[PDB]
Amino acid sequence: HTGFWLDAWRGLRRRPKFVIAAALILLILVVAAFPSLFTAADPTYADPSQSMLAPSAAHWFGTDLQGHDIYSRTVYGARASVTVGLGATLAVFVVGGALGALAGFYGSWIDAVVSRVTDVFLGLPLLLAAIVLMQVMHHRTVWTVIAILALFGWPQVARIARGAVLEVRASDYVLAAKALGLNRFQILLRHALPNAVGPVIAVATVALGIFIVTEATLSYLGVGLPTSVVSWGGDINVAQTRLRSGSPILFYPAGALAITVLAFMMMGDALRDALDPASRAWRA
């Protein structure tokens, strides 16, 4: 009766997994956008008087070594991680989708070179390549991290988009359309973008959580974000010594880190099971 963009909403509106993931994602987005709303304290204030205080009404999440209560420190880190993930995912979606489409639809002398390029970029495990490249940078800011991540994140989305478009190209409506005009580009847009825009959305909303995890574990080692930006995985690095003594300070930032990734993964799962169930048996 209406575009597939409207009946799918109703078909998913009654999905507990989806509604839970959406609520959690909205909460994460609003806390990352407007940090200063929840409390008014400042995260970089360092009082050496209190150093290992316990949770209380005054300081909810106790205090760290130098006095920073973990509560305010566990918000701007969310802001940083979320903006990293979102920017990288948007860029990688655009680039990978565009290249995979232009490769799968045309064929000779283009899909060949694109396959060569994505195969070359496929031999590099993301973590190792990022580690090697982040050794030569002195201007370490958030933007360079987003750049280096998107530089290596695309091959998978490229492969998925290429497969999807190469499959859709083997239909008959795409032929009947060109049988009456619509030179090879306008037809490409009008008929191959909508009927295949699904799989790329699924792989992108999973690669989002992938990138978030990668950024966290990379900033943990100390070759990631600088110390100027409060961030999970770097609030953990300075808390690994006191963990072996039996004080669970480390688990509060990690507790927030292990939740956003979950909210993204179990949302990508719902979107995939709703829009492209077929490719579950031999992929993922």
Partner: protein
Amino acid sequence: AAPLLSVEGLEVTFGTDAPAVCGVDLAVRSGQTVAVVGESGSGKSTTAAAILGLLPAGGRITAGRVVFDGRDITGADAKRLRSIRGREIGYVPQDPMTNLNPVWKVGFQVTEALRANTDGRAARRRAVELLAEAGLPDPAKQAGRYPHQLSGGMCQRALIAIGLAGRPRLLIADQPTSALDVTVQRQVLDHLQGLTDELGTALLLITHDLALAAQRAEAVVVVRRGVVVESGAAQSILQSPQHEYTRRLVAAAPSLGDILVVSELTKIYRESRGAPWRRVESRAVDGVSFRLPRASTLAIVGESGSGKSTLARMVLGLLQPTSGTVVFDGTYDVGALARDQVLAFRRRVQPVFQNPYSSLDPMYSVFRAIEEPLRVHHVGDRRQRQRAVRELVDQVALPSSILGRRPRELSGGQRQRVAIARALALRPEVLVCDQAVSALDVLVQAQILDLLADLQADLGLTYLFISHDLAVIRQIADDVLVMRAGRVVEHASTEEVFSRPRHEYTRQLLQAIPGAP
């Protein structure tokens, strides 16, 4: 006494939806052949699989009984049916492609169908014997090929050989030759009918057309919406249909200047088959030349793989020919179409493609798809488009509440009707039916053929209708052109094709229709 397989009252349902097979009945006399016939979705396979306990996930028996020599096998009991499957009741699938594990060396999938054996010496050679009596060209060499390597004509022979493993006392062959093609269907069935009487098997076979079921079997059981309609002998039913439904069904059985002149059209394929320095070509079509008068119907008939679809494209310009001329109307050359000529020409020829399920851009509204040809040439401003659509949707039946729908929510025939309407959107002068009426039940088949006949009689178009058989051509077309091996085999009017053939191929093609005179 004791007729085998009296199945009074099967009432299967699929996951609390509705009774998908209502009260049916039949009794095989343990030595006779019974063929049930029914349109699509009538519930023939379902009741043929519900006997062996091969029901899919949702299915379940709810009433009725199926005795076999006198013992109810309704209580599936997957400890007892092992004492029957393969030993008393065989099976034959319908799809010859996806019914063989494709990684198991069919010579080996057969070698265990006789599992009652010593497992290591007699199998590898009794199986070759079985394939030999199955009729394959050379069983020894083909017993070492994967199922993805064989053609359709051998896959079904292998399936039949598997079926006839323990020489079952009853066979439930389920639409065997439904995906095969003619002049292979007839030979496979002739081999089967001979392989049958040597054991006494009953051979309950499912099929979907009268003329064949009567000339092949002895009794007929017609079913509509999972309900037995009638039963009796073949001659007495076909010649004397009593119920209105079977009357309609037999009445719908098919048994009884110039604008475009191609010349020496030819097309090759530079195929690559392995070693990069070892490239062999495959000549698709060659030596074709004919003429097409206006307001007429010239049709192309050929076997599976005769090179007809490529010829249709090359006529529709969507395929660059290798040599030959396809000049149209004396002005539009197809070889080197000039700049303006592409859009000056696409509006006088239009195609109609093969299946109704995959030629509709599933994300399109039935109105937004029809309007597309009316849009690309920028004719009709905003609402005269609705005018033209409301006039078109009545040239085909298509009750005008069908607008705004999606392809996913339509029936079969309506899809082809919409395709024909869209092709008729911009006043074409020639249509090209790419096996249009090939995937449909008999009733909608004859209905859309009648519709096309009317449209020709009302517009003066010229069809190039294309088929893979010869039974569906006699009351519509007027010229015929048989093709085989990429070449031309015969070109003449229909009367000389139905009375006095002139080539041994045309003969064994005519006498292969369900006519059998």
